[PDB]
Symmetry: C4
Subunit: 387 residues, 4 copies
């Protein structure tokens, strides 16, 4: 049967560690892919990790980074959570350089985008069988979430972008049932920018928090019901969430302009009027990570908070991050559990190698006691191929 998804997030007070795979440390000698943009998604029986490779093994001459990100070699695969991604324990999913995937309670759905920059085509697979395709409508790059899509009562939802990455673009919301596109509307948001949204279900609706890459240092959001009627805005707190960003000060609900261009993919959770914010420690480069709890952050513009918990120290590298949930059909509780993951990037451009890769850690929220520490990557660069 299908995941009902008519429950609310249940209260938490801290986060406990869930997994850590040690990809690069193992990949120094063993056979490990070169990956980027990992993410985690859970069925009603297990949880898996998805990632995007370019066909190259760490510490090999084919890992020379002159291949473009949108190259005809990248693929989407998956391995059980907490394991080093190698060609001997991974499953093939689709051919893509931008992707997402979610499970509706019966079978896996995957979305994968490939093709030239003016004609990219998204291929939708349901249970390993091609079912539908979507073609770019504004002829720039068609890109998608890079994290899990959200399923409620058998239908699964996602958001797509197509247009300039430093100006006004075009935005759409898709509703998918059994691998077939059933309905879609396009957002009417002048002066907003949405990229790489991370969506979660809550009380029968969907909420997504995205990345503003044009003139914003705080984050935008969008929420809609199963009939696609949406609402838009920005997070009104004074604890800015993007990267780069100014210092903490007086926030605002319309785009914040200071240090706005560029960003990193991120997330947040809504609890009434409060908000849990996850952001990097450094205001100019991708270093560190922490979790903040501002009890009036969704609607008030002050810069005062209540609880902070450390995840990675400010001297170590981090990257993308996103959210995922565990349904009651899996965990046996009567509430939706929230979790999240982080990606730790090593290599170019901040270090002197020829490659670039990432590993992951992930946490899940609880109500009992917790502690704050630092769980960095720990690889010792440069490798043999670099010398």
């Amino acid at each position: 049967v299908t995941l009902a998804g008519n429950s609310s997030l249940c209260p938490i007070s801290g986060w406990a560690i869930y997994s850590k795979d040690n990809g690069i440390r193992i990949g120094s000698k063993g056979d490990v892919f070169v990956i980027r943009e990992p993410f985690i998604s859970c069925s009603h029986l297990e949880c898996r990790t998805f990632f995007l490779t370019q066909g190259a093994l760490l510490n090999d001459k084919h890992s020379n980074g002159t291949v473009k990100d949108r190259s005809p070699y990248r693929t989407l695969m998956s391995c059980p959570v907490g394991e080093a991604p190698s060609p001997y324990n991974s499953r093939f999913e689709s051919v893509a350089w931008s992707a997402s995937a979610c499970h509706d309670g019966i079978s896996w759905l995957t979305i994968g985008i490939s093709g030239p920059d003016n004609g990219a085509v998204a291929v939708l697979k349901y249970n390993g069988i091609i079912t539908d395709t979507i073609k770019s409508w504004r002829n720039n790059i068609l890109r998608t979430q890079e994290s899990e899509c959200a399923c409620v009562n058998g239908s699964c939802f996602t958001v797509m972008t197509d247009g300039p990455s430093n100006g006004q673009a075009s935005y759409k919301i898709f509703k998918i049932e059994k691998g077939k596109v059933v309905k879609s509307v396009e957002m009417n948001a002048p002066n907003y920018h949405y990229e790489e949204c991370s969506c979660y279900p809550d009380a029968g609706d969907i909420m997504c928090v995205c990345r503003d890459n044009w003139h914003g240092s705080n984050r935008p959001w969008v929420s809609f019901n199963q009939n696609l009627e949406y609402q838009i805005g920005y997070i009104c707190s004074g604890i800015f969430g993007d990267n780069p960003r100014p210092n903490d000060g007086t926030g605002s609900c319309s785009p914040m302009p200071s240090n706005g261009a560029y960003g990193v993919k991120g997330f947040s959770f809504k609890y009434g009027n409060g908000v849990w914010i996850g952001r990097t420690k450094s205001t100019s480069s991708r270093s560190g990570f922490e979790m903040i709890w501002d009890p009036n952050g969704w609607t008030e513009t002050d810069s005062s908070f209540s609880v902070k918990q450390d995840i990675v120290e400010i001297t170590d590298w981090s990257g993308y991050s996103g959210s995922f949930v565990q349904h009651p059909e899996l965990t046996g509780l009567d509430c939706m559990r929230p979790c999240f993951w982080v990606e730790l990037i090593r290599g170019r451009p901040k270090e002197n190698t020829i490659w670039t890769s990432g590993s992951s850690i992930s946490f899940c929220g609880v109500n009992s006691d917790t502690v704050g520490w630092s769980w960095p990557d720990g690889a010792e660069l440069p490798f043999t191929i670099d010398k």
Copy 2:
């Protein structure tokens, strides 16, 4: 229960990409077999990839090619679709230097030929148990399809050749039920040549398109029902399909003599009077690939077509190609979906190495939007062992 196979191919307008394994790029460092003649075949639950190895790993001293193609070391194996063929994730099938395999809805059937050139014997296995054998009837190299066999209502069909490869030969059609040969007739075709046929079922009958290696630059075909009553001919279009071939011009339905003394294994699909033709871009060497749609190509000798879609650019290497289908019991439609695969050869004789190998890509036909691009192999030769 068994696959009924009493339905027709359903309409398509383009092809979408399905898989890509990146064999050689990974095999530069990891442990990957040296393979040739890959092909794909699907059961009622999954799809697998079959291939022929010589017992050697890539980038090793045993990969030197002083070994004949018909050697006592080659074997047939299989791995899940879209994965690099390695000894740690492959299944053993049979000992052979020429093979084919299909699934009837209950268990796998495999055919494998081994032995000397004047006494080769084909061993038939059903569910991993030897059941029957066929011995050469003209004491010359015995050979078979090199792609999937076609099953309708439980019975499975295949075509075999035995005789000279530059003159008149002897041809047979076999009907197999549960690994036992039930009926066989030999074709009466003077001035025809059939090798490496690729067969698919359509509306309760079988249609095969083969390779003419004696004096033909276009392709022959044969169709028969479940009682083995056949019909023969050539494709009457003016868009020649073999390789090497002359320039496009006025075609014919009897062997085209110009440039017709060698070839490459290929395929085609029939839609009423039209035809989908898949052929290499270069007229003299194995470079490129494309798909053509000639609405009157099965019976008219005119060189005008309607739609072309690119698969690999003319500057990159390609090779064999064939067809396979996905039954309604697997995909849930009311069709018989068509698909195809391509092999990309790297190494001797066109390059300066000591080995030769191939990887694969595959596509499946749809009715929504698609795009044309190039998905080449991408390995950087020569390897370490060559230096």
Copy 3:
């Protein structure tokens, strides 16, 4: 259904060999983790081996041992009994630098401790889902059994320590049902020290034998029922069991002070008034192993035995050891079978390398004929990375 565990240990006269994995000999060339503290635990269908890695493969530059034992990289994993632990056949369990795990007849329970030395937090997982946490109550290094926990009628029991490792500490006993902590009491034992206990069920109760690291060369024990009412003492035999230890002489039932101030994790079985003692052959370093049977050892202070059986010679290295049992639901008998395992340490500090690791052997007790021999590790040090 759940393991009843209301039966007694059945009589034995000797031990037969059960498994041997050859970790280091294989790891000289292949890809094998660097592990320590292995242990074995059995469900109602199979038996598995758990271990703690630091994220590094054997014979690699990341195996350089300047990483602390309590580091943010260690993880808990498991592989089938008798196999070399490699990243291609292991399952991820939890992130920890101190752990234990047992199976209640329905699903696996794992406990893992991570965090700083003054705030360590234990995360309890039941069937792969986080359920509860325990935080340190005296702000010193928190630590647990390092071997299997004991389950009787669905409930599972374990013992934890928190405080100085050369003085008085604080001790607790926990009762867990379906991953939730239900009851706990703290031991009142002045002048006792308990670390790394190895517990087994017997006739509906629990008995644990632990390691005294403050002033003891013989071992302490504790026994309790399902309502947590405990009894404490020391093993009253004159065959001392710890390491380092004095020569055999007149034993005591309260701490023996001579050569007491250190130890190694060990075990013992109780049979009425007798006892089976497993200890190293050398009295000052970890070399050798043997099994002793003293028919009045649990309550009498003489030093006279009846049977000795050799496991490893005195010239070879050994280490930790512990106990586990096989329930009637698994083995089909009418009695609880006892078994044990041993760890063989190679590398620093007794040898000139840069790493340290261990492999394992294990035995199970029978009633028929047996033999004594030596089954050492057998690796030839130093490795290539050391040169």
Copy 4:
């Protein structure tokens, strides 16, 4: 349910090839064990390959050959038929330097011998749980079949030897039900020698053909029913079967003395008064292999035969060989199908390396057409470690 085994062998006229794994050719670069004495045994669902390793990978420094054959490192494992034995796809069975195993229709039974030369103890496992042990009764090297044991109606049978290998010894037959020894008698055979027997069931009884290592160049046999009432003799044909052996001449039914004092493990099948003999081509070293059919060979002393089929040429290395069968519950016939396997030894003492290993091929008998060829090993020695 259990294998009934009340059927007779069904008629055959030739042998068809079944599997070939290519162990050494792959092991030149990949990770492959160093094995000896492989054998094949089939359940009611599949067939597996068992072998004895010493803990070392091919092409590694631990593969030196100063370790004795009876060493504390050897183990018994198994992998699916037709695959290269590697630590990433093998199952652990038992710790032994002499072994056998058979399947009764419900679970696997394995026998493994380990220990010193005057106290070796055999450990019997049924479904992975230790059940019984047998200890040496004459304090000399205890040894067993090295191939599959034979099961009829829920009981499984085997033969064991203990005593000198160049003189009179002591012989026993064991009957095992569910891993427990139920009955045993010792053979009364003056002037006979039995080692490494290969047994198969036929019409409700058991027949074994063994190796005479004291003064025999032809082979002995023994047959018994389910109550252990035996009959003894020698094969009365003039086509000698051992190795070394004299030239073909007039045979005898009592020990043949010429060139008798050594041998190699072998097999034979009985058909009324005929016999199928499998022997090496060279009369002094282990080179080649062939199958002979002497229609009166079981009772007559002439040297004339009818059919010969080649398996390996006389210029290539071979070794041990044995027999196994496929029950009607597996194959679906009304027979008991016969098959066999061969081992191909490479390395010391006939070649200049530091190691020794073997790969395998296997054949199964049919009634249709067949061919004779040569399927040798094909590795190119010496390896890198030898240089």
